[PDB]
Design a protein around this motif. Structure first.
Motif, PDB file in Angstrom:
ATOM      1  N   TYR A 181       0.564  -0.988   0.086  1.00 36.08           N
ATOM      2  CA  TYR A 181      -0.255   0.405   0.082  1.00 36.08           C
ATOM      3  C   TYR A 181       0.504   1.098  -0.469  1.00 36.08           C
ATOM      4  O   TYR A 181       0.513   2.306   0.369  1.00 36.08           O
ATOM      5  CB  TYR A 181      -1.098   0.084   1.610  1.00 36.08           C
ATOM      6  CG  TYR A 181      -2.330  -1.454   0.569  1.00 36.08           C
ATOM      7  CD1 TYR A 181      -2.072  -2.288   1.413  1.00 36.08           C
ATOM      8  CD2 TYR A 181      -3.009  -0.758   0.206  1.00 36.08           C
ATOM      9  CE1 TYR A 181      -2.807  -3.370   1.509  1.00 36.08           C
ATOM     10  CE2 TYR A 181      -3.792  -1.626   0.300  1.00 36.08           C
ATOM     11  CZ  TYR A 181      -3.944  -3.154   0.495  1.00 36.08           C
ATOM     12  OH  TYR A 181      -4.773  -3.696   0.535  1.00 36.08           O
TER      13      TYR A 181
ATOM     14  N   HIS B 191      -2.299  -5.832  15.051  1.00 33.10           N
ATOM     15  CA  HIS B 191      -3.336  -6.514  14.741  1.00 33.10           C
ATOM     16  C   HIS B 191      -3.694  -7.431  13.954  1.00 33.10           C
ATOM     17  O   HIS B 191      -4.165  -8.935  13.681  1.00 33.10           O
ATOM     18  CB  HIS B 191      -3.973  -5.052  14.010  1.00 33.10           C
ATOM     19  CG  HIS B 191      -5.052  -5.333  13.099  1.00 33.10           C
ATOM     20  ND1 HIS B 191      -5.232  -6.333  12.091  1.00 33.10           N
ATOM     21  CD2 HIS B 191      -6.207  -5.521  12.845  1.00 33.10           C
ATOM     22  CE1 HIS B 191      -6.180  -6.902  12.075  1.00 33.10           C
ATOM     23  NE2 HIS B 191      -7.329  -5.849  12.459  1.00 33.10           N
TER      24      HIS B 191
ATOM     25  N   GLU C 173      -6.740 -11.896   6.437  1.00 35.37           N
ATOM     26  CA  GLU C 173      -5.959 -10.567   6.732  1.00 35.37           C
ATOM     27  C   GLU C 173      -4.096 -10.649   6.370  1.00 35.37           C
ATOM     28  O   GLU C 173      -4.151 -12.351   6.538  1.00 35.37           O
ATOM     29  CB  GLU C 173      -5.805 -10.284   8.235  1.00 35.37           C
ATOM     30  CG  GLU C 173      -4.578  -8.103   8.621  1.00 35.37           C
ATOM     31  CD  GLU C 173      -5.148  -7.410   7.218  1.00 35.37           C
ATOM     32  OE1 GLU C 173      -4.510  -6.968   6.635  1.00 35.37           O
ATOM     33  OE2 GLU C 173      -5.605  -6.561   7.145  1.00 35.37           O
TER      34      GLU C 173
ATOM     35  N   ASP D 200     -11.045  -8.901   7.872  1.00 32.07           N
ATOM     36  CA  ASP D 200     -10.172 -10.115   8.307  1.00 32.07           C
ATOM     37  C   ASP D 200      -9.984 -11.154   8.666  1.00 32.07           C
ATOM     38  O   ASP D 200      -8.911 -12.489   8.900  1.00 32.07           O
ATOM     39  CB  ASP D 200     -10.008  -9.007   9.946  1.00 32.07           C
ATOM     40  CG  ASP D 200      -9.410  -7.825  10.000  1.00 32.07           C
ATOM     41  OD1 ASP D 200      -8.894  -7.579   8.718  1.00 32.07           O
ATOM     42  OD2 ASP D 200      -9.806  -7.422  10.576  1.00 32.07           O
TER      43      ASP D 200
ATOM     44  N   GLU E 231     -14.629  -8.162  11.521  1.00 31.58           N
ATOM     45  CA  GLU E 231     -13.833  -7.177  11.336  1.00 31.58           C
ATOM     46  C   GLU E 231     -12.942  -7.164  12.183  1.00 31.58           C
ATOM     47  O   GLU E 231     -13.287  -6.919  13.911  1.00 31.58           O
ATOM     48  CB  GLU E 231     -14.786  -5.954  10.816  1.00 31.58           C
ATOM     49  CG  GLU E 231     -13.154  -4.601  10.870  1.00 31.58           C
ATOM     50  CD  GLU E 231     -12.060  -4.433  10.338  1.00 31.58           C
ATOM     51  OE1 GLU E 231     -10.648  -5.490  11.236  1.00 31.58           O
ATOM     52  OE2 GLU E 231     -12.355  -5.215   9.062  1.00 31.58           O
ATOM     53  N   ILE E 232     -11.728  -7.448  12.724  1.00 36.71           N
ATOM     54  CA  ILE E 232     -10.976  -7.087  14.290  1.00 36.71           C
ATOM     55  C   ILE E 232      -9.798  -5.601  14.358  1.00 36.71           C
ATOM     56  O   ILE E 232      -9.520  -5.451  13.426  1.00 36.71           O
ATOM     57  CB  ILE E 232      -9.482  -8.425  13.886  1.00 36.71           C
ATOM     58  CG1 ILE E 232     -11.080  -9.571  13.982  1.00 36.71           C
ATOM     59  CG2 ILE E 232      -8.791  -7.537  15.637  1.00 36.71           C
ATOM     60  CD1 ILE E 232     -10.909 -10.226  15.086  1.00 36.71           C
TER      61      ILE E 232
HETATM   62  O1  LIG Z   1      -7.585  -3.927   6.415  1.00 34.63           O
HETATM   63  C1  LIG Z   1      -7.410  -3.339   6.652  1.00 34.63           C
HETATM   64  N1  LIG Z   1      -7.124  -2.413   5.953  1.00 34.63           N
HETATM   65  C2  LIG Z   1      -7.148  -2.795   4.412  1.00 34.63           C
HETATM   66  C3  LIG Z   1      -5.145  -2.546   3.642  1.00 34.63           C
HETATM   67  C4  LIG Z   1      -3.796  -3.684   5.277  1.00 34.63           C
HETATM   68  C5  LIG Z   1      -3.246  -2.469   4.771  1.00 34.63           C
HETATM   69  C6  LIG Z   1      -2.041  -2.614   5.025  1.00 34.63           C
HETATM   70  C7  LIG Z   1      -0.978  -0.953   5.391  1.00 34.63           C
HETATM   71  C8  LIG Z   1      -1.284  -0.015   4.606  1.00 34.63           C
HETATM   72  C9  LIG Z   1      -2.914   0.184   4.455  1.00 34.63           C
HETATM   73  C10 LIG Z   1      -3.471  -0.912   4.668  1.00 34.63           C
HETATM   74  O2  LIG Z   1      -5.182  -1.281   3.988  1.00 34.63           O
HETATM   75  C11 LIG Z   1      -7.197  -2.490   7.800  1.00 34.63           C
HETATM   76  N2  LIG Z   1      -7.167  -1.027   8.061  1.00 34.63           N
HETATM   77  C12 LIG Z   1      -6.959  -0.821   9.380  1.00 34.63           C
HETATM   78  C13 LIG Z   1      -6.644   0.192   9.432  1.00 34.63           C
HETATM   79  C14 LIG Z   1      -8.560   1.762   9.604  1.00 34.63           C
HETATM   80  C15 LIG Z   1      -8.144   3.147   8.044  1.00 34.63           C
HETATM   81  C16 LIG Z   1      -7.150   2.142   7.409  1.00 34.63           C
HETATM   82  N3  LIG Z   1      -6.478   1.474   7.879  1.00 34.63           N
HETATM   83  C17 LIG Z   1      -4.907   1.669   8.052  1.00 34.63           C
HETATM   84  O3  LIG Z   1      -4.899   2.796   7.963  1.00 34.63           O
HETATM   85  C18 LIG Z   1      -4.103   0.310   8.182  1.00 34.63           C
HETATM   86  S1  LIG Z   1      -2.905   0.295   9.231  1.00 34.63           S
HETATM   87  C19 LIG Z   1      -3.669  -0.631  10.775  1.00 34.63           C
HETATM   88  C20 LIG Z   1      -3.482   0.197  12.227  1.00 34.63           C
HETATM   89  C21 LIG Z   1      -4.092  -0.132  13.288  1.00 34.63           C
HETATM   90  C22 LIG Z   1      -4.434  -1.421  12.915  1.00 34.63           C
HETATM   91  C23 LIG Z   1      -4.574  -2.062  11.639  1.00 34.63           C
HETATM   92  C24 LIG Z   1      -3.850  -2.382  10.825  1.00 34.63           C
HETATM   93 CL1  LIG Z   1      -3.748  -2.615   9.495  1.00 34.63          CL
HETATM   94  N4  LIG Z   1      -7.176  -1.237  10.380  1.00 34.63           N
HETATM   95  C25 LIG Z   1      -7.738  -3.138  10.192  1.00 34.63           C
HETATM   96  O4  LIG Z   1      -8.091  -3.496  11.152  1.00 34.63           O
HETATM   97  C26 LIG Z   1      -7.854  -3.149   9.313  1.00 34.63           C
HETATM   98  O5  LIG Z   1      -7.669  -4.690   9.156  1.00 34.63           O
END
Ligand SMILES: O=C(NC[C@@H]1Cc2ccccc2O1)c1nc([C@@H]2CCCN2C(=O)CSc2ccccc2Cl)[nH]c(=O)c1O
Ligand SMILES: [Mn+2]
Ligand SMILES: [Mn+2]
Length: 180
Positions: A28, A45, A65, A93, A104-105
């Motif tokens: 990403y 996470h 995930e 997830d 969703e976790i």
């Molecule tokens: O799957 C998820 N996102 C899809 C991919 C996966 C991915 C990886 C890197 C960069 C981007 C990215 O998007 C996902 N995203 C989020 C949050 C909410 C807003 C978007 N976000 C991020 O900024 C990702 S950092 C993050 C911070 C704390 C916990 C977990 C994470 Cl992953 N929280 C989730 O629990 C979740 O599962």
């Protein structure tokens, strides 16, 4: 430049978690070397997702995930056209084969009420179960259905508090709290 948070993340989480987080961040377009606090948050996470998957029976949870974006969606369609369950708009997830629902976790440094509300606002999918954990031991699930054993959720919570203690012992907790 090499930060303290980066060197802590690689020492705290197992190597399989770190590279799965590193690959996901670069996929990403974000650098784990610079956004070190989000590097820690993804490893956290991710570990919670794996511990959650280890809670039920052997073939109960399907992990979405950690996968690459294309493969994570490939598994979802296979599950959807197998289960007759609506395809979620956003990537979840997990999937619970016993209760027949995506999960969703969430893991936060804020109020469990606050994050659930914004997590449900962005989801907009009424079917996907939501399950939030906190670094303080709080948890809120949809319809108060917490899915797993009391012992399984408890193992997750104590792990989260251990992470914050290790961060606090290195003065990195304050910066991590103000990053979310
Ligand atoms: O799957 C998820 N996102 C899809 C991919 C996966 C991915 C990886 C890197 C960069 C981007 C990215 O998007 C996902 N995203 C989020 C949050 C909410 C807003 C978007 N976000 C991020 O900024 C990702 S950092 C993050 C911070 C704390 C916990 C977990 C994470 Cl992953 N929280 C989730 O629990 C979740 O599962
Ligand atoms: Mn996810
Ligand atoms: Mn999540």
């Amino acid at each position: 430049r090499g930060s303290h948070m980066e060197d802590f993340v690689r020492q705290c989480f197992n190597p399989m978690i770190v590279e799965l987080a590193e690959k996901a961040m670069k996929e990403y377009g974000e650098d784990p070397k610079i956004e070190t606090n989000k590097f820690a948050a993804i490893c956290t996470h991710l570990e919670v997702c794996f511990m959650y998957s280890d809670g039920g029976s052997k073939h109960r949870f399907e992990i979405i995930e950690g996968r690459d974006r294309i493969m994570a969606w490939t598994v979802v369609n296979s599950i959807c056209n197998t289960t007759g369950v609506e395809k979620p708009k956003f990537l979840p997830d997990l999937y619970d084969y016993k209760e027949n629902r995506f999960i969703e976790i969430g893991v936060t440094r804020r109020e469990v009420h606050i994050y659930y509300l914004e997590k449900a606002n962005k989801i907009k999918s009424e079917k996907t179960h939501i399950h939030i954990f906190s670094f303080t031991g709080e948890e809120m699930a949809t319809k108060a259905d917490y899915t797993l054993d009391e012992e399984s959720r408890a193992r997750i919570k104590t792990r989260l508090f251990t992470i914050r203690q290790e961060m606090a012992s290195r003065s990195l907790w304050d910066s991590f709290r103000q990053s979310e």
